[PDB]
Structure formats: structure tokens, C-alpha cells
């Protein structure tokens with residue numbers, strides 16, 4: 001059927017602020033008796049009125065049927081703008097969303113979730129494994145616990161993507177590995193480390209992912225030192241698919257800085273709020289654009305205080321890639337529960353004292369955090385405040 | 386083993402006018418020698434320079450090896466743009482193409498085929514039955530009969546597809562069928578009847594098939610009346626796979642029109658140039674979007690002057706589907722013989738008088754014509770020049 005950007009509750013085509021074209025959802029909606037509504041407040045923080053200002057509202061289970069290619073992986077995005085739609089209190093909305101037998105959301109309150117994030121809108125993004133079916137059935141089910149619950153949706157995107165997931169190294173364990181090839185994933189965070197926001201229009205692979213500056217997630221007292229590649233520095237992908245990440249991710253990084261003695265005394269630390277009781281994959285993106293040789297910059301990486309790369313196998317970007325300007329990533333997996341970090345993921349970097357490196361520093365170019373499904377479920381609870 | 390769109394002779398990723406992404410063919414070329422070439426001339430009829438303006442040229446045999454799932458059916462497309470490449474005379478190009486054990490093309494002249502069609506480029510499309518092999522070997526062999534014979538290719542696509550083929554009713558016989566489930570097929574024609582061209586980007590199943598307007602193929606004096614479903618009319622597929630055809634096929638149709646007297650005195654007639662000595666499957670796509678009951682519109686269907694639906698079993702779309710808005714298709718098979726049939730398939734419809742229907746009309750929403758393989762061969766001769 002091909003990729004779609006549906007603005008729910010619209011009757012004509014529309015375009016957003018980033019030159020993405022959207023179309024009405026009506027075509028794809030199997031079930032009747034939905035309500036369409038336009039919000040009566042346009043939050044000044046919205047980047048566009050599209051798709052956010054218009055919604056479709058469901059008071060019974062409702063299914064969209066989107067033609068897809070069965071053998072392919074897809075990105076699915078759900079856009080929500082909890083605002084005022086004439087005649088409803090958005091606080092009453094609690095619902096489930098499923099996509100071909102994968103549960104995405106359950107008892108989901110967009111209002112509570114937005115309040116907790118201090119953001120007026122939400123985009124939930126998922127990477128769905130191939131389901132061998134030529135229709136993606138997206139079912140919205142109002143809560144059967146609350147008589148007054150309704151479901152709503154402002155936009156849906158379905159985007160074919162390559163098989164960009166394979167194995168991840170298990171954090172804190174010696175050489176253990178797990179397969180992500182058939183996993184369903186939720187995108188939790190996607191950062192351009194040390195660099196400016198990259199809008200979807202500048203993403204690679206036609207995937208229109210947004211990559212956010214990482215500064216708001218730095219937990220260490222030190223912000224470190226951001227690095228920028230020289231003008232027209234060439235990112236040499238070699239055999240890495242360009243869809244993994246756009247070149248600009250690799251042209252900037254965050255490092256600890258030029259003072260190796262100070263760097264040895266601290267970790268550069270990021271912290272993220274996530275849902276308990278899931279395995280997460282952290283994809284760390286690297287590209288050395290300053291140094292040229294093995295054993296110049298060699299560093300330990302820790303996830304939730306456990307070893308990701310350390311001891312006699314620390315991280316060395318040139319050690320991994322063989323050459324300045326080659327991009328790469330490494331995937332690490334951690335099951336996060338009460339004993340392992342609770343509701344938080346921490347990522348920490350510090351120089352290694354193995355093999356007498358030329359410098360004592362660390363760096364990172366990009367970061368993605370994905371939730372893996374457990375028994376075809378990705379739904380977590382709503383956040384607190 | 387993913388789907389591929391290879392633009393042969395390129396060294397950078399490219400994209401065409403319909404946003405299809407293409408990549409270089411280099412990694413998949415397994416045996417032989419070849420060079421990249423760029424066409425000297427951009428024909429104004431080309432929608433894109435991708436993949437058509439670049440080619441790989443073979444002066445001896447060469448093979449691609451493409452990873453596939455052996456238990457799955459595939460679409461294979463071969464793109465050709467005859468032009469002057471590396472100083473060679475395109476009129477000397479005659480070659481064979483094989484995909485595993487299936488001969489697709491033999492003594493193939495892209496130049497002559499293009500001249501006969503009044504088209505500057507060709508896309509040959511095949512549906513290959515499961516191979517039980519994890520590699521698709523695509524072999525290009527220059528003709529060993531002409532001395533300066535060479536082969537060329539501009540683009541290759543390999544696309545995993547569902548099993549969209551089963552049995553077809555043999556025309557002019559009753560309860561005799563042809564089995565296409567494990568056949569290798571060539572796509573000859575694919576039409577949105579009564580509607581505008583549907584580009585591959587809008588095709589269902591992610592199969593990127595183009596559905597072309599049918600008007601050029603009508604040979605009755607009357608072109609009938611084209612119909613379009615109302616705004617927000619929904620096509621209700623039920624258990625028919627959406628990969629069969631996109632919704633827009635079913636939202637338009639060609640009919641004979643509102644004058645039943647005129648309709649009763651004529652056939653709506655399509656004609657197609659094909660290759661003799663093959664069995665063809667005609668897939669007729671239907672969806673009733675105006676009427677609502679059985680025995681409102683009831684019509685006879687003839688293929689090569691023989692009965693496909695007639696007598697006491699004429700076509701009735703609601704009769705078949707049970708409801709307005711439910712799409713369907715019916716497959717019919719016909720052998721086109723070396724004398725009778727004579728390089729053409731004709732499809733004709735006219736109203737039936739059987740059972741006193743409310744109206745006297747006929748309609749059709751889409752049409753596909755497939756060649757079935759014989760002796761593991763789908764190759765036909767080059768058409769006559771004019």
C-alpha cells in the first residue's frame with residue numbers, strides 16, 4: 001500500500017512545518033461511528049497544526065487496516081495532542097492500542113503522560129517485526145474499566161524500514177548476546193550526542209526520524225566538551241547501511257575533554273526515565289573524526305553501573321573501525337527491574353587504564369534507546385506527576 | 386535476502402520520479418566481466434533517468450546471484466533502455482536471460498521491441514514460482530549467432546510476493562481448469578479499467594506494480610462510460626487479500642452505459658498483442674459500487690470469441706460477491722494457438738438477457754493478463770518492426 005502519514009479527523013490533504021505531506025485517515029478506518037474533532041486551543045509550543053489540531057475519537061473498539069508488505073519491518077508512529085475537543089475532558093481518556101497482536105499501549109493516558117513530560121504533544125514510535133500479513137490492523141480499545149473512557153488519535157504514520165536490528169551484547173555478562181532481529185521495539189530516546197537537533201526531513205533512509213540534542217539528559221556535574229568534525233569531513237559508511245543514522249550524527253560528539261587527569265576522576269553520565277520490567281537496547285553511535293590510530297582514545301562504558309565495555313576490552317573507536325571517519329554502532333542490552341536500576345537507565349563513560357593510551361578521554365556521537373517486547377507487549381504504566 | 390532494486394551501471398544510490406530507491410548492482414554480479422555505460426541520449430518520454438540512463442554491458446555471459454527465500458514466490462523485473470552504449474550499435478544486441486532454470490528472454494532485441502511498441506523503454510515483469518533455492522541466478526547470455534551480439538541491462542528488481550495465483554477456468558469448457566499455483570508467469574498487461582494510471586508507489590502489497598489506464602486497448606467503436614465510486618466509498622475486501630489489487634482499481638470501472646438498447650447491440654471490446662503458443666490467464670477484477678442487488682446488471686463475457694461467462698451462468702457482480710463494495714476477481718485461461726487466436730487476445734462483454742435483469746449493461750474494474758510458462762520457457766519472438 002506504501003508508506004502513509006494519516007492526519008486523523010481531517011477531510012483534505014495537509015502539510016506540516018517540515019514539508020511532510022499528510023492525508024485523511026478516513027480511507028483506512030474499518031469501523032464506523034467515530035467522532036472527528038478539532039482542538040479548541042492551539043498550544044504555542046506546537047511545531048505545526050498538522051496532524052495535532054485534529055483528532056479522531058472512539059467510544060467502542062475501532063480498527064484501522066493499513067496495507068503493508070508482509071515480509072518487511074515497519075516504523076509505526078502514533079501522534080497525540082491531549083487538548084480540548086468540544087464536549088470532552090481529555091482526562092477521561094484511557095485506552096489500549098494493538099498492532100497485529102503486539103500490544104503497544106494499555107490504560108494509556110495522553111494527558112497524564114504529557115503533564116509528566118511538560119510537553120503539549122506526544123509521538124509514540126515503534127519498530128514492528130514482520131508479521132507475514134499484507135494488512136497492519138491497528139486497534140484502539142477504550143478501557144473496559146471506566147464506563148466514560150474513550151480512545152483518541154491525532155496522526156498515524158506507517159513507514160517501511162530495513163532490518164536494522166541484529167544482536168546486542170548483554171550488559172554485565174561475559175560475551176553473552178541476544179537476538180533483536182524478530183523483536184518488536186519501542187523507540188524511547190534518539191539523540192544526536194554533542195550536536196543540534198536533526199529534523200525528520202534531514203534523516204537518512206527516508207525514515208524521517210528526529211534526533212535530539214543530548215544535553216537535557218546529562219546527569220554528571222560536567223557537561224563535557226562537544227566536538228565538531230572539520231568542514232566537509234567525509235563520513236565513510238563503507239558497508240554500513242546509510243539508514244542506520246544520517247551523516248550529521250557522526251560529525252559531532254560529546255567527550256569528557258582535554259584534561260586526562262580530571263577525566264580519570266569522573267564519568268560522563270546520561271540518565272533516562274524508562275518503564276520497569278523490560279529489556280532495553282542501547283545503540284551507541286561512534287565515529288572518530290579527530291584521532292587516527294588505535295590506542296589513542298580508549299574508554300570504559302557502563303550501563304546501570306554494570307560493564308558494557310571495560311576491563312581488557314574497553315572501547316576504542318579506531319580499534320573497532322580501523323580508520324578515522326568510519327561510522328559504527330554497538331548495541332548493548334539490559335533487563336531493567338527493581339534490582340537493576342528501577343525506572344532509570346544510566347549510561348557512563350570514563351577513560352580506561354588498560355594498555356597505556358595516548359589520551360585519557362571518552363566520546364560518543366549518537367544514542368538510541370529501544371524497549372524490546374516481552375510476550376508481544378510494549379505497554380508500560382503512565383508516569384506520575 | 387531482502388527486496389532489491391538495482392540500477393545497473395551506477396556507483397551511488399539513486400531514486401526515481403515515483404520515489405523508489407535504487408542501489409548499484411555491483412555486489413550481486415557473480416561471474417563474467419562487464420563495464421558501466423551511460424546512454425548518449427535522454428528520450429523525452431522517460432519519466433526518470435533512474436534506472437534507464439545507466440547500463441551494464443555484457444559481451445560474454447554473466448550471472449547475478451541474488452539471495453532469496455526458496456519457499457517464496459518472487460516478482461522479477463528487468464528494465465531496458467535501448468541506446469548507444471560505449472560506441473556499440475544497439476541493433477546488434479540479441480541475448481538470452483534465464484532465472485534459475487526458467488528462460489525469460491531468448492534472441493531478445495530491445496531495440497526492435499521498443500520500435501514496435503512506440504515506447505523508448507521496456508519493463509519485463511515475471512512472477513517466479515518457489516525455487517527451493519536460497520539464490521536466484523540471473524544469467525545474461527549474448528547471442529552466439531550474431532558476431533557483435535551483446536547483452537545489456539539497466540535495472541533489476543527482485544521482490545518477494547504472496548502466492549496470488551491459483552486455478553483459472555479454461556475458456557469455452559466447463560469444470561476444466563489450469564493450475565497456476567506453481568507456474569512461472571510473465572505479466573503481459575495490467576490495467577486499471579475506467580481509471581487513471583496507478584503508480585507503483587500507490588500499489589497494494591508493497592509490490593509497486595503500475596496499473597495503466599485501459600483506453601488504449603479498446604477496439605469497439607464505443608468506449609462505453611467510465612464510472613467512479615462516490616467520495617469516501619469504502620472497498621470491503623473481506624477475506625480477499627489486499628495484495629491482489631489496490632483499492633483504487635475497484636473504485637473505478639468501464640461500463641457500456643445507461644442506454645440498454647445500444648448496449649444490447651454491441652460488445653465492449655479490448656484487444657491485446659501477445660505471443661502465440663502459450664496459455665494465458667486473464668484476471669478480471671470486479672467491484673459493484675453503484676448497484677446493490679442481484680440481477681440488476683448481468684452480462685456475458687467472451688475471450689477470443691469463446692464463452693467465459695454466458696448462457697445460464699452470465700456474470701453478475703453482486704451475484705458473485707453478495708454486496709455492493711466487495712471486490713473480487715475471476716481468472717480465465719486460454720491457449721493461443723499457432724493458427725487460431727493469431728497473436729491477439731480479445732476480451733468482450735455485452736449484456737445478458739437471461740433472467741430478465743433490471744438493466745442491460747456490463748462493467749469491469751481491472752484487468753491483468755499473464756503468460757504461463759511452457760517447457761520452462763516464457764520467451765517469445767521479437768515483434769514485427771512497424
Ligand SMILES: *[C@@H]1O[C@H](CO[C@@H]2O[C@@H](C)[C@@H](O)[C@@H](O)[C@@H]2O)[C@@H](O[C@@H]2O[C@H](CO)[C@@H](O)[C@H](O)[C@H]2NC(C)=O)[C@H](O)[C@H]1NC(C)=O
Pocket residue numbers: 661662722723724
Ligand atoms: C508454435 O506451435 C506450432 C505448432 O502448432 C501445432 O501444430 C500445428 C501444425 C497446428 O496443428 C497447431 O494447431 C498446433 O498447435 C509450431 O509449428 C508451426 O506451426 C505452424 C502452423 O500452426 C506451421 O505453419 C509451421 O510450419 C510449424 N513449424 C514447424 C517448424 O513445423 C511452431 O514452431 C511453434 N512456434 C514457436 C515459436 O514455438
Ligand SMILES: *[C@@H]1O[C@H](CO)[C@@H](O[C@@H]2O[C@H](CO)[C@@H](O)[C@H](O)[C@H]2NC(C)=O)[C@H](O)[C@H]1NC(C)=O
Pocket residue numbers: 264265266267302304305306307348350
Ligand atoms: C564510573 O562509573 C562506574 C559505574 O557506575 C563506577 O564503577 C562502579 O563503582 C561503584 C562504587 O561507587 C561499584 O559499586 C560498582 O561495582 C562499580 N562498577 C563497575 C562496573 O566497576 C566507577 O567507579 C565510576 N568512576 C568514577 C571515577 O566515578
Ligand SMILES: *[C@@H]1O[C@H](CO)[C@@H](O[C@@H]2O[C@H](CO)[C@@H](O)[C@H](O)[C@H]2NC(C)=O)[C@H](O)[C@H]1NC(C)=O
Pocket residue numbers: 094107109112145381382383
Ligand atoms: C490506569 O492509569 C492510571 C495511571 O495514571 C492509574 O491511576 C493511578 O494509579 C496510581 C496508583 O498506582 C495513583 O498513584 C494515581 O493517583 C492514579 N491516578 C488516577 C488519575 O487515578 C490506574 O490505576 C490505571 N488503571 C488500571 C486498571 O491499570
Ligand SMILES: *[C@@H]1O[C@H](CO)[C@@H](O[C@@H]2O[C@H](CO)[C@@H](O)[C@H](O)[C@H]2NC(C)=O)[C@H](O)[C@H]1NC(C)=O
Pocket residue numbers: 649650651652687689690691692733735
Ligand atoms: C459480442 O461478441 C461475441 C463474441 O465474439 C459475439 O458472438 C460471436 O458472434 C460471431 C458472429 O455472430 C460468431 O462467429 C461467434 O461464434 C460468436 N461467439 C459466441 C461465443 O457466441 C456476439 O455476437 C457479439 N455480441 C454483440 C451484441 O455484438
Ligand SMILES: *[C@@H]1O[C@H](CO)[C@@H](O[C@@H]2O[C@H](CO)[C@@H](O)[C@H](O)[C@H]2NC(C)=O)[C@H](O)[C@H]1NC(C)=O
Pocket residue numbers: 479492494497530766767768
Ligand atoms: C532473432 O530475432 C530477429 C529479429 O526479430 C530475427 O530476424 C527477423 O526474422 C524474421 C523472420 O522470422 C524477419 O521478418 C525479419 O526481417 C528479421 N529481422 C532482422 C532484423 O533480421 C531472427 O531470425 C531471430 N533469430 C533467431 C536465431 O531466432
Ligand SMILES: *[C@@H]1O[C@H](CO)[C@@H](O)[C@H](O)[C@H]1NC(C)=O
Pocket residue numbers: 276277337381
Ligand atoms: C515488575 O516485575 C516484578 C517481578 O516480576 C513484579 O513484582 C512487579 O509487579 C512488576 N512491576 C511493574 C511496574 O511492572
Ligand SMILES: [Ca+2]
Pocket residue numbers: 006007008009010051052053054055056153154155
Ligand atoms: Ca489530525
Ligand SMILES: [Ca+2]
Pocket residue numbers: 192193194195248249250251252253254364365366
Ligand atoms: Ca553527534
Ligand SMILES: [Ca+2]
Pocket residue numbers: 391392393394395436437438439440441538539540
Ligand atoms: Ca541503470
Ligand SMILES: [Ca+2]
Pocket residue numbers: 577578579580633634635636637638639749750751
Ligand atoms: Ca478501475
